[PDB]
Amino acid sequence: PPVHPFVAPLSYLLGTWRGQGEGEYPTIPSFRYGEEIRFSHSGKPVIAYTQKTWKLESGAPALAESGYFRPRPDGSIEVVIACSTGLVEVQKGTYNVDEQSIKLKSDLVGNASKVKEISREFELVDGKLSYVVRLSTTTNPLQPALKAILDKL
Amino acid sequence: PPVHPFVAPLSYLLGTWRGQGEGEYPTIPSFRYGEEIRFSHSGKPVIAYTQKTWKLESGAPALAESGYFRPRPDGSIEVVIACSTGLVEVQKGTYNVDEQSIKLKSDLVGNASKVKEISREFELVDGKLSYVVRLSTTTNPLQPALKAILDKL
């Protein structure tokens, strides 16, 4: 299927990406992980997102998430994600064509015991996909939790 | 990876399924669709769920959803789903080993303009996967909306 006009500005995402990241948060000792992301489409104004992580040393599976990115030609975007840990997120924000960036903040986090808000920011940097995930809790204000860089395969 | 002990009671789901369904709802004329579901795992206490639908005549893509099923040995289960239309759901309920059934009701529906609650019920019937999805809105009480039967591939 052809790329939908609403998806075309984000066509740089389409494909599979692999790299590594680092997590750290108050009370959570720093850790590293491997990550793979696939962005795909079926001609609708939606990009399917699938992600998995693993332990570096072994490749042992860790977590997974999946969802859908819905860009619109005014530069707005909404993203819905379900996580293997049992959370859901509704993310809203904007994309910037000049910067090849996507900036999202949660409108909703569902089924979480502690997390209150999640922000997600993507940026293409020299053709690599970077992101920062920031998290808040009732007692910890929004702050970095995960960051990764992935190469396009 | 081996099947996790918490997943084993639902191992009958694992694989790919294809069939067809029918939708109908107040103000929504009846329609039919094709459907494919895959259930998979990576050795964690989680089953990954991916689904797509299409038009019967042509096979043209329609919608998609994906998420995660988290069964527990007391017979409880939670399910998180993200939909290509831009919704999320947190579903909670129970599974029954004798009946090979799973009965879920939403604790949360996110980003919906009209839907308030969603219930999902699966049943293995002569080795085929059946479900009923029921939906409510502010003015329409919970009632059937989608039903499908799928053969295991």
Side-chain angles (χ1 to χ4, degrees):
Chain A
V3 178
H4 188 284
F6 295 1
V7 168
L10 296 184
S11 63
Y12 66 86
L13 293 175
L14 297 169
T16 305
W17 304 81
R18 192 173 304 112
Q20 63 180 274
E22 184 171 26
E24 192 175 4
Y25 201 75
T27 82
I28 303 169
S30 90
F31 60 92
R32 294 181 185 273
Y33 54 94
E35 186 171 2
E36 188 172 306
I37 296 170
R38 182 180 145 102
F39 291 106
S40 61
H41 76 98
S42 58
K44 303 302 188 198
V46 188
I47 308 170
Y49 163 71
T50 58
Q51 181 262 31
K52 64 184 155 195
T53 58
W54 56 88
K55 292 182 271 205
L56 294 175
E57 320 79 39
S58 60
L63 296 177
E65 65 187 30
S66 61
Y68 301 94
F69 285 47
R70 292 164 54 68
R72 285 187 66 89
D74 63 357
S76 70
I77 180 168
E78 70 181 5
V79 172
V80 288
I81 297 169
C83 187
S84 67
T85 66
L87 281 52
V88 297
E89 304 165 45
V90 180
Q91 287 287 348
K92 300 196 175 189
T94 59
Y95 66 90
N96 184 308
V97 167
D98 298 321
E99 305 180 356
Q100 298 175 120
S101 65
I102 304 170
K103 294 183 179 192
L104 300 166
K105 307 171 47 185
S106 56
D107 213 15
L108 179 153
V109 176
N111 208 43
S113 60
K114 299 286 176 66
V115 169
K116 297 303 299 195
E117 295 82 45
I118 302 170
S119 75
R120 294 175 179 248
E121 300 187 357
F122 298 89
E123 188 185 359
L124 201 72
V125 284
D126 197 29
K128 305 184 187 305
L129 185 65
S130 70
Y131 68 77
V132 178
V133 179
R134 294 171 168 84
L135 302 176
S136 68
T137 73
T138 295
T139 61
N140 302 108
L142 190 71
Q143 60 190 274
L146 303 166
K147 57 179 64 59
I149 303 170
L150 301 86
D151 287 343
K152 200 177 192 185
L153 307 181
Chain B
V3 178
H4 188 284
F6 295 1
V7 168
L10 296 184
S11 63
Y12 66 86
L13 293 175
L14 297 169
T16 305
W17 304 81
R18 192 173 304 112
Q20 63 180 274
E22 184 171 26
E24 192 175 4
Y25 201 75
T27 82
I28 303 169
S30 90
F31 60 92
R32 294 181 185 273
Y33 54 94
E35 186 171 2
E36 188 172 306
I37 296 170
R38 182 180 145 102
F39 291 106
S40 61
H41 76 98
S42 58
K44 303 302 188 198
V46 188
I47 308 170
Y49 163 71
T50 58
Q51 181 262 31
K52 64 184 155 195
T53 58
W54 56 88
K55 292 182 271 205
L56 294 175
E57 320 79 39
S58 60
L63 296 177
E65 65 187 30
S66 61
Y68 301 94
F69 285 47
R70 292 164 54 68
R72 285 187 66 89
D74 63 357
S76 70
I77 180 168
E78 70 181 5
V79 172
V80 288
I81 297 169
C83 187
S84 67
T85 66
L87 281 52
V88 297
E89 304 165 45
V90 180
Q91 287 287 348
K92 300 196 175 189
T94 59
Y95 66 90
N96 184 308
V97 167
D98 298 321
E99 305 180 356
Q100 298 175 120
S101 65
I102 304 170
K103 294 183 179 192
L104 300 166
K105 307 171 47 185
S106 56
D107 213 15
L108 179 153
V109 176
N111 208 43
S113 60
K114 299 286 176 66
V115 169
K116 297 303 299 195
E117 295 82 45
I118 302 170
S119 75
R120 294 175 179 248
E121 300 187 357
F122 298 89
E123 188 185 359
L124 201 72
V125 284
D126 197 29
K128 305 184 187 305
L129 185 65
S130 70
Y131 68 77
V132 178
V133 179
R134 294 171 168 84
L135 302 176
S136 68
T137 73
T138 295
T139 61
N140 302 108
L142 190 71
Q143 60 190 274
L146 303 166
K147 57 179 64 59
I149 303 170
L150 301 86
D151 287 343
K152 200 177 192 185
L153 307 181

